[PDB]
Amino acid sequence: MFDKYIVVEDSLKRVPGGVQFGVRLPYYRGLGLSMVETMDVTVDGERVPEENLTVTLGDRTVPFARRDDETDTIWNFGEIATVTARLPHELGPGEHQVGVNFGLRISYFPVPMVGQDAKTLKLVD
């Protein structure tokens, strides 16, 4: 649900030590960050471990590994979060593939609710 919209076009930007890009949540309402149980990120097919990932919602930036404490931080419906990936080398210009695979801890559903997307993004300057 909303899978084709997870990775936001034109959003890949360099930051110190890696890249940032925009991500939307594949769910029909806002959800507390603590129930984003998995968000597997790949850059150029390479996995970004959870310790190198941060999520920015509005004015709050949280390390992805600390999401358990973000029970009331809402990833609002349609809201673009800035996901920051610390990478082991600088990214050259031009296009790169960004993949996001979500598993959501939905309380009325017995197993993680899933959404997945990958897009070719150009490094916008």
Binding site: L31, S34, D68, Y108
Partner: peptide
């Protein structure tokens, strides 16, 4: 309404 009973891991 919604009820996020699994809000806490």
């Amino acid at each position: 309404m919604f009820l996020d009973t699994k809000k806490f891991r």
